[PDB]
Amino acid sequence: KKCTTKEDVLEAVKERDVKFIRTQFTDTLGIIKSWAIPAEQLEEAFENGVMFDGSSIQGFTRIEESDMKLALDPSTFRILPWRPATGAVARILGDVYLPDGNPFKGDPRYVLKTAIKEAEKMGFSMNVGPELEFFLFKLDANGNPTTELTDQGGYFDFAPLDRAQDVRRDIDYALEHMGFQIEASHHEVAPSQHEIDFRFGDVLCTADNVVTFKYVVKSIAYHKGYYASFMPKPLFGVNGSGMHSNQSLFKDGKNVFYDPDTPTKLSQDAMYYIGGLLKHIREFTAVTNPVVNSYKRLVPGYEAPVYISWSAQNRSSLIRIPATRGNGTRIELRCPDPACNPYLAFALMLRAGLEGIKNKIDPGEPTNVNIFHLSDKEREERGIRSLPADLKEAIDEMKGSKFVKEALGEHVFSHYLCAKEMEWDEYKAVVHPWELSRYLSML
C-alpha cells in the first residue's frame, strides 16, 4: 500500500518493527548524505521538522546560513531491503527550509523541483529511465575495495557462474522487492561490468531512486564480500561506466515526442527538445561528468561518446533515439556517468530541452556515420563539435554559462565550480607513476 500521510508512515513503522529511519539527501557535488533517527523520535520529526547543519549540503567553505530544517515527506518513506537483528530500516526524504521559513535554494532536489515547475508552467511533465552501469570487484583480505575482477565475461554473457552469480541475483532481488521495478539487467562489455535498467518514471521519484540504488547496491555487495564501484573509469583499456538517461515529456499522459503523422513518427517538439539539449550540453558537462576520472571514460574506442551529435540509427551518438514509438517514445543521452548528482543533471537536461521547445531550436541534421573515423575537416565541415576533454575544460565552459547559472541558482553554481576548481588543482600537481615509467630512464 501507498504511504501518503504521516499516520500511514507511523502505522507502518509499528506493524513492521522499523527501528531506525535514515534521511536521504545529496550535497552540491552528488555525495549521498544521511543521518539516523530512532523510530521513537519519528513522530516528533513529522510535527516540528528536524534541524540539521546545512554545511552537509553546502560545505564548510563560507560563512552562510547553516541551521536548516528538514520537513519530512511521508510519501518518500520506503523500507530498505535488509533486516538487521535489531529491526527493519527505512529511508525518507524531505524539503529543506531556512530559519525564516523559505526553502533552501542550495538543495539539489529543490533545483530539480524548480525545473519541474517550469515544465509544468508549459503543461509538461518529464519521465526518465536511467541505465546504471557498474563494476563488481573483489574485496582484498582486509575488506578493502579493489579492482580485482570477478569474471572475464563480455557483453550480455551469462556470467558470472560462481559465487558472484548469487550476489548479482541478490542485488536484483533486493531492488525489485524494495519496489524499484527493474526492467532488465545484463552483463556489460567490460570484464566484471553490469547494467541494471530502471523503469521509466516520474523524474523526481527517479532521481530519488538513483540515490537509493547507489547505497543499497553497495551494502548488498559489501555484506556478500564484494565491491560495487560506480567509478566512471576504474580500469584503463576496457569500457567505463555511464548513466544513459532516456527521457520524454508528457502532456497529461500523452507522450509529446510522438506524432503519428510524420515520416519518422517523432514530433516537432521532440526535435526542438533535442536542439536545446545539444545547444547547452557543453556548458554543463561538468555536471553530468563531474570528476577527473569522468574524462578518462570520455575518450575514443569504447561505449563512451565524445562528439556532439544526434541520431536514430547510430547506436553511438551523444543523443540516440530508440525505435520505440507511441507512449514509449524517448531520447537517450549517453554522455553522463554514474558519479553525477542526478538532481542537478536531470534538471539541466529538462531546462535545456524546454528552451529548445520554447525557442524552436532546430537540432540540425543527424550524423549517421562513425564520427571517430572522420577527419577534422570533415568534422569541421559537418560542424561536429566535441565535448570538453578534461574537467578543467568542462569547468571553464560552465563558468561562462548564464543558462547553467540561471537553471542551478547562484548558490549552487558558485559552490559547484569552486569545489571542482579545487579538485582539479589538486589533481594537476600530482606526479604520476606513469611519468616515472616514461621519463626517469630517459631524462
Binding site: 513492521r16 523500507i79 531491503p81 535488509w82 533486516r83 542485488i171 533486493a174 522487492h177 524494495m178 555484506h223
Partner: protein, 95 residues
C-alpha cells in the same frame, strides 16, 4: 488438565517467560520451528514453539500471560495424564 502449544515471535520469548513466572507457571518446553512481510528480505518465517501443561485453573492465566508477554497463535489440547518419572507422581501433582 491441559496441553497448551504457543508459537511466539522469537524476539519476545523471555518477555513471555517473565509474564509466565509471575503467575507461578515455570515448567515449559521451548523449541525452534518455522511458520508478504518478509519477502523483501530474502536476499539478506522463524518461530518459537512453547509447550505448556497447565491445569484447568491456571488455564486462562497461562493464556493471558503468553498473550501479554508476546504482544509487545495459541493451541489448547486435552491432557489426560502426566507421569513424573523421578517421583512416579501422576495427574495434577506431577505438573
Amino acid at each position: 488438565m491441559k496441553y497448551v502449544i504457543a508459537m511466539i515471535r522469537p524476539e519476545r520469548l523471555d518477555a513471555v517467560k517473565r509474564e509466565l513466572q509471575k503467575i507461578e507457571v515455570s515448567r515449559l518446553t521451548v523449541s525452534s520451528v518455522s511458520g508478504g512481510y518478509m519477502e523483501i528480505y530474502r536476499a539478506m518465517l522463524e518461530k518459537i514453539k512453547i509447550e505448556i501443561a497447565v491445569n484447568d485453573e491456571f488455564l486462562e492465566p497461562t493464556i493471558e500471560a503468553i498473550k501479554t508477554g508476546a504482544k509487545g497463535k495459541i493451541f489448547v489440547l486435552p491432557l489426560e495424564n502426566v507421569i513424573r518419572i523421578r517421583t512416579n507422581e501422576t495427574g495434577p501433582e506431577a505438573i
